[PDB]
Amino acid sequence: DIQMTQSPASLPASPEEIVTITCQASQDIGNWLSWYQQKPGKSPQLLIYGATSLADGVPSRFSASRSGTQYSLKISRLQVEDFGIFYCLQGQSTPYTFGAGTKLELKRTDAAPTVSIFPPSSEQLTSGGASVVCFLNNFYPKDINVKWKIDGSERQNGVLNSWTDQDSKDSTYSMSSTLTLTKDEYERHNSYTCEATHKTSTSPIVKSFNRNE
Amino acid sequence: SRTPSDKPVAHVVANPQAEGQLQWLNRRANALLANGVELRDNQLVVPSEGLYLIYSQVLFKGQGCPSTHVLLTHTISRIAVSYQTKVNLLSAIKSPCQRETPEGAEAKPWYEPIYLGGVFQLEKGDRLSAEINRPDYLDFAESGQVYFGIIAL
Amino acid sequence: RTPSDKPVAHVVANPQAEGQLQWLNRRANALLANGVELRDNQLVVPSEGLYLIYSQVLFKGQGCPSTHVLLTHTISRIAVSYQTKVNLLSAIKSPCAKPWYEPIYLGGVFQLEKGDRLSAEINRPDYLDFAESGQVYFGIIAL
Amino acid sequence: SDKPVAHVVANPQAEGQLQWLNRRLLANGVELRDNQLVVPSEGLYLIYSQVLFKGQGCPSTHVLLTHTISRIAVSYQTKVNLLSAIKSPCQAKPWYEPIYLGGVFQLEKGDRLSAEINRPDYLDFAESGQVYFGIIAL
Amino acid sequence: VCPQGKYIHPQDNSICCTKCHKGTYLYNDCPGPGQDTDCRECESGSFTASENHLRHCLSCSKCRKEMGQVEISSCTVDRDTVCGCRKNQYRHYWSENLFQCFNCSLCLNGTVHLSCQEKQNTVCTCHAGFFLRENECVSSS
Amino acid sequence: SVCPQGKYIHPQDNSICCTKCHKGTYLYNDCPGPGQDTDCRECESGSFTASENHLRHCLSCSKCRKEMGQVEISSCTVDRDTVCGCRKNQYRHYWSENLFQCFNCSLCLNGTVHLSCQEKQNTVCTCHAGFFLRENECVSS
Amino acid sequence: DVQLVESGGGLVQPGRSLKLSCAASGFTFSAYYMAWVRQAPTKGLEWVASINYDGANTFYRDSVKGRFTVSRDNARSSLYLQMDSLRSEDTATYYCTTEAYGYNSNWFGYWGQGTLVTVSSAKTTPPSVYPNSMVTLGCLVKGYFPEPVTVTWNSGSLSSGVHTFPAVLQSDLYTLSSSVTVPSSTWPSETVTCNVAHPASSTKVDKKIVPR
Ligand SMILES: O=C1CCCN1c1cccc(OCc2nc3ccc(-c4ccc(=O)[nH]c4)cc3n2Cc2ccccc2OC(F)F)c1
Ligand SMILES: *[C@@H]1O[C@H](CO)[C@@H](O)[C@H](O)[C@H]1NC(C)=O
């Protein structure tokens, strides 16, 4: 099988910029390469065929070139409609193989998150379970690390955290970490902390709650 | 006499009566299968691994030029014996109509041949195919206008 | 260092014979060898076997005319088995202030018997390019 | 088979020209010297080649493509055409034009065979299946 | 060696086999100097139009609908398809075997000199007050 | 060398040398004796040989490309190929090493001539500011 | 103009079978290679199967070597895909594209709208909603099947400051969370409520956040 190494995975940029996405081919695939753009919630559209040719009805600000096994897509003057995920496709051999993808993201000044820690609910503790919820809202860049601390000890079992796509108004991401535990193990310990390291602060933001109070 | 040749060669031609498709024949005059090559499931079967010259021609014909711009294609590919792996070797495309045929003037007939061939490394048991997109524009009128063949090196 | 006995032939067009495509072999880099002959502007097969048959023509014109122009290049066979002109390879090209050039190369592998006659022909010799050598040729190669 | 034979393709590294590369068959005497094939011994040979031109839209000026196989013989120390062709691809959409050459020729030892074009900037040199040059002793 | 109607056997130079008749192809050569030759009728869509010793049949040619042609006689096993033009039409041959069907000229503003033929257009002579330009009667106004 | 200047090596004898043929002649048969004349004969009508040769055939005479607006400078003789060129007030644009086209020399009307028209080089023109040279000819904006 | 339409996608149990349909209009369907291309939720594009003009040649992915079967009805201008012996891995949104061919190249030109296929043996289950200048409050949603779930806050009274997070899966069960950011001067004076809704189980709940 032929594998298509696409880089970068994510790419921040602003309008009127010059942006270049590349794909590297496991073997020789010739001109049997095509690029695609997929906007959120919609189907993919064909961008470039024959490795270097603009597809029908594609704006002229797109371009592409080729080296031996390396293929690059270039956007001359970046426009707002050009934000999404881009894929490269090889068509020489079966199975036809897609790239990993490249997410184009609107650049923004850094922003520290607003951490909100929540002990479990009263109705939850009745159902034999208990889930601790720690939010991290409106921050940038998207890279972030979260660590749970049950009485100072780092807990890595039972975490189900899901990130969100960057906002439309402010272009900031948000993450929600959830730690569900048994009611017998939720009342055994006392203090649960939420640690969040980010590129905005050298000191990880800590928010905790003690069962004493 | 002279020593005959063991070189795997083939030359198959289109079936004129089988309209709506491109079906290759070898049991006609001046069609050929020799020294291992076979025509099975409308595909040339390669007997020995090595370098092969693939050559083909499909003669496209029409009358006038419609409003919708027509694109004619022709593509040759191979299928390997194990895992049925498809490899694309040759392909061409031609738009024979630069502009719509103006009314009032005679819709003159046009003829656009597509030649497609090259040298490729083939494996044993490979099944070679030669496919076009729109058989509506084929030319079966006379012999020798649509052919498909391979010659080992 | 033993010479080859394969019947081969490679004949070039006559630039001095406008209005027709007359195949010549008495020229540099033109060939008739090991039994092949040229009779009635046709190549004659000296022994049965597998043959490569090829012919290239180069059509040219100064601009696109008003009346339609149709170009044809056909290699034909007249066999002892079937003494009638039969098309082997055929092509029809419609090419339409600046000059245009349309080359047609036709080749294939065929089974031939002793006594066959092969001919490469066109319909418009007023469009052939006799300017330089190597542009119009006709030949067969035995396998 | 002891018959001398060569099949060389273009050199993707040497962009800006058509430089033949034997490794990427060249066996039994046929040498590649100064981008030319040197006949190792006299006899009948089959000379073949194909190049693939391609472009991206038709420019303002006219475009002419030439592909020519030439011969410098010991009998005749002057470059002489064996197989030549010309194409005119342009009369926003990309175009593609191959050119095929092939014939049989009686050659002598020491002869040099070249295969040249006029527009390397339009050559799809990477398509080695359609950019090659070769001879085979019959 | 072999007289008319007979061909020389391929494997052995001595034997003369009788050629197959039109509509049939060679299935096998004759075994002996005076024995029959295995010949079988051409299959569907194929034909042989002359005596032959041909191991395969020719493909039935078709009528060029783009040249305005029409089928005169269909393809039989012994005769290829014969194509032609319609009524009040003539043939203009672009090649030896390539012809197109054009409607016969009517010599408007003129009189028919020579009637329309199968391969020649109507010959026209123009009325009073008309010049003749490529077989058409144009005015002088 | 195996043979002295102006001579070639015999195909049969590896120790006997023959004299090359002259311009306008081809090789009919190699020289018999070590000091005897080689059978060279003049090229026939329509062919030539423009170099010392032991070639056994003559090259085909070239012709001028009437589609390139070319005209014949000198005809083809036995020792010189056809030489073609352009007319007066015209220059050559070589599309290839041997393929050239004729174009009328630019006139530089409403412009300054920096160099006259040449055989293989067009007039060098620069136009007054405001007027531009789209086809190497000055025209206002 | 040109349009492809997929039909027949739905939730199916493991080991079951399903048939997908692709309606083509606006072009010569008989003049294109046809192909299926799937992508799993929060994942990239994966080629599935291709079929030639006359349907005589079929090419499948190794993951579906003997299970899927692509078919083609040119007269009806429709492309079909028979998904048998479904697996949890086959849960993805499925597209049908045109596989065109140019000069030594190919591409997927025309894409369909896409149909959604889900493979899970779990049965339908409704959710269980559990409840500084700015005050950020939020209500969770755990244990629902299948998707989707529409979470609203104060019946849309407050749109800004709402972050409805993408769902996550755990043991054949989904779980999402939402958050609302309102000024401290509004709550608990507002008693802001979150309105969850599960149109698959026909359930709907209104829950105000009240401190412990
Ligand atoms: O597809 C089509 C339709 C119309 C033309 N066309 C096509 C496609 C590709 C190449 C081509 O010509 C270039 C070419 N590449 C070759 C690669 C290999 C060989 C070869 C043949 C025998 C052998 O023993 N060794 C090598 C020959 C090649 N030729 C010339 C050629 C082509 C077809 C038939 C005969 C022939 O030789 C001639 F008899 F001298 C033509
Ligand atoms: C020819 O005569 C017709 C009457 O039949 C007339 O209408 C026409 O104008 C004449 N030809 C031309 C060129 O005017």
Author numbering:
A (entry chain L): 1 to 213
B (entry chain A): 5 to 157
C (entry chain B): 6 to 101, 111 to 157
D (entry chain C): 9 to 32, 36 to 102, 111 to 157
E (entry chain E): 14 to 154
F (entry chain F): 13 to 153
G (entry chain H): 1 to 131, 141 to 221
Quote the study that presented this structure, word for word.
TNF is a pleiotropic cytokine that exerts broad functional activity via binding and activation of two distinct receptors: TNF receptor 1 (TNFR1) and TNF receptor 2 (TNFR2). The small molecule compounds bind in a pocket at the centre of the TNF trimer and stabilise a conformation where a single TNF monomer subunit is perturbed, thereby inducing a molecular asymmetry in the trimer which in turn affects TNFR1 receptor interaction stoichiometry and subsequent signalling. To facilitate further characterisation of these small molecule compounds in a variety of contexts, we here generate a monoclonal antibody, known as CA1974, that selectively binds with high affinity to the TNF trimer–small molecule complex.
In order to confirm that the CA1974 antibody bound a single epitope at the distorted TNF interface and to study the effect of small molecule on receptor stoichiometry, we generated a complex consisting of CA1974 antibody Fab fragment, human TNF trimer, UCB-8733 small molecule inhibitor, and human TNFR1 extracellular domain. The main contact between TNF and the Fab is via the heavy chain and the displaced TNF monomer A. Heavy  chain CDRs 2 and 3 form a contact with the outer face of monomer A and CDR3 protrudes deeply into the open cleft of the distorted A/C receptor-binding site. As predicted, the structure revealed that CA1974 recognises a unique epitope at the perturbed A/C receptor-binding interface, formed as compound captures TNF in a distorted conformation where monomer A has tilted and twisted down and out. Unsurprisingly, given the degree of distortion in the compound-bound TNF, there were a number of very significant structural clashes between several surface loops on monomer C of apo TNF and the CDR and framework regions of CA1974. When aligning through monomer A, as done here, the relative repositioning of monomer C can be exemplified by the 7.3 Å shift in position of Tyr115 preventing the pi stacking described above from occurring. Whereas in the structure with Fab and receptors the loops are stabilised through protein contacts with either receptors or Fab. Consistent with previous work suggesting that small molecules reduce TNF:TNFR1 stoichiometry from 1:3 to 1:2, which leads to a disruption in productive receptor assembly and signalling, the work described here, using a fully human TNF-receptor system, supports that conclusion. The elucidation of a crystal structure was only made possible through the inclusion of the small molecule inhibitor and the conformation-selective antibody CA1974.
